[PDB]
Design a protein around this ligand. Sequence first.
Ligand code: CLA
Ligand code: CLA
Ligand code: CLA
Ligand SMILES: CC1=C[C@H](O)CC(C)(C)[C@H]1/C=C/C(C)=C/C=C/C(C)=C/C=C/C=C(C)/C=C/C=C(C)/C=C/C1=C(C)C[C@H](O)CC1(C)C
Ligand SMILES: CC1=C[C@H](O)CC(C)(C)[C@H]1/C=C/C(C)=C/C=C/C(C)=C/C=C/C=C(C)/C=C/C=C(C)/C=C/C1=C(C)C[C@H](O)CC1(C)C
Lengths: 215, 30
Amino acid sequence: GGISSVCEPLPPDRPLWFPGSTPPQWLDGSLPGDFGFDPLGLGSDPETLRWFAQAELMHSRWAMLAVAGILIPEWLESIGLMENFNWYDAGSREYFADPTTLFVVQLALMGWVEGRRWADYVNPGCVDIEPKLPNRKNPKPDVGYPGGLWFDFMMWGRGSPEPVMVLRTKEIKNGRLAMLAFVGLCFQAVYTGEGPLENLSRHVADPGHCNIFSA
Amino acid sequence: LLTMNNKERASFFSKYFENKNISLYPYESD
Ligand code: CLA
Ligand code: CLA
Ligand code: CLA
Ligand SMILES: CC1=C[C@H](O)CC(C)(C)[C@H]1/C=C/C(C)=C/C=C/C(C)=C/C=C/C=C(C)/C=C/C=C(C)/C=C/C1=C(C)C[C@H](O)CC1(C)C
Ligand SMILES: CC1=C[C@H](O)CC(C)(C)[C@H]1/C=C/C(C)=C/C=C/C(C)=C/C=C/C=C(C)/C=C/C=C(C)/C=C/C1=C(C)C[C@H](O)CC1(C)C
């Protein structure tokens, strides 16, 4: 009737990665993108399952940001709005500081927030960033899905347009696709010796050739 | 007469609960 802000677990007859097989007992559909895929049984322990879910979420978000920052500047260079973009050679460019001191500064700045996130995972609610306004009531967020004023300034979560489970599976699926994409780009940059969009262009033309088997 | 009977000099003419109230305060927007 209103907006439900709780994740709804998928029914036990949900579509699976391998239809006709029995989904594992530790995957009951309560997690985003739950398709019953665990051949090695790595998620048997619920605590390790929570840690692996958070790790998958983090890898998903970093991979989506990574693939966006590879593809969009590469699509701009092919269009012509970037003079000398190359994501493989981007790390060896000349900046205002050495890579080592930039790495140390990045380590400190990122280990602040990664460690605040660690404290939130260990103790939910120990660190709160959303303001405690005098009569506004802050809803309790899920671990790994925070966000009031800063991380969720759109209020697109918490049951708004698509239910929280639907948007979370969408995020997880795009993240898995981006992880596979980034690993593919990393292998293509050292195998083909070319860019991503160039490789796509030579694969779309005569796809019977210009493949993994022709370098 | 201000419940001080002694002031009865007019002596003639010249011719609501159940609503219930709660504490409401404005708060910051979304
Ligand atoms: C996620 C999707 C994905 C996509 C769309 C592409 C796309 C492309 N790749 Mg990359 N690639 C990927 C992942 C992906 N790759 C991964 C995971 C790896 C290795 C770990 C590689 C390593 C790789 C190599 C070594 C080469 C390419 C090349 C190419 C072209 C295909 C021809 C071929 O020989 O490669 C097939 C290579 C594979 C190793 C198969 C990996 C497929 C993964 C496991 C699953 C993707 C399937 C899934 C249904 C994706 C959805 C499709 C679509 C809806 C997005 C094409 C432009 C070729 C190139 O451009 O030459 C000119 C080539 O030389 N790729
Ligand atoms: C970044 C790491 C990562 C992690 C930690 C997870 C974690 C998880 N996955 Mg996800 N997943 C990922 C990436 C990841 N995934 C990718 C890339 C795909 C697409 C191929 C999927 C597709 C997927 C499906 C279809 C399903 C899950 C599900 C699960 C959950 C239970 C399984 C498990 O116990 O995982 C433990 C995982 C790890 C500790 C990683 C171990 C990997 C080994 C050590 C090596 C990595 C292999 C190799 C290098 C791959 C290279 C690329 C390849 C193309 C060559 C758990 C939350 C299940 C679910 O219920 O969703 C919540 C489920 O049904 N995942
Ligand atoms: C790729 C798709 C994707 C999807 C579907 C989701 C989905 C979800 N996320 Mg995740 N997330 C992602 C990527 C994604 N995320 C990335 C890359 C990060 C790392 C930065 C995060 C980190 C993250 C946080 C920290 C939070 C969420 C939250 C949520 C919810 C918000 C709805 C949503 O994001 O809008 C769906 C639509 C989009 C993602 C469209 C893509 C955006 C385009 C590319 C750019 C944005 C446009 C423009 C530049 C921005 C405005 C400009 C302005 C700053 C001036 C939803 C469950 C919130 C939560 O769960 O709370 C309940 C929470 O606060 N996410
Ligand atoms: C087997 C099995 C078993 C059991 O049973 C179950 C399971 C676990 C589920 C399964 C599966 C697994 C898997 C497959 C996994 C995978 C993963 C991945 C792929 C990741 C990535 C992932 C990925 C990621 C994060 C990424 C990241 C990235 C980055 C940061 C980047 C950066 C950059 C950029 C942008 C650009 C520039 O110029 C350069 C640089 C600076 C370099
Ligand atoms: C590899 C290869 C190779 C060859 O050569 C070529 C080809 C084929 C092209 C390639 C492939 C590729 C691929 C497939 C990829 C994929 C990707 C992805 C998925 C991404 C995402 C991506 C994604 C992304 C960025 C996203 C992002 C997001 C965000 C920020 C968000 C934000 C927000 C939030 C949270 C909440 C609030 O309330 C609102 C807002 C504020 C709005």
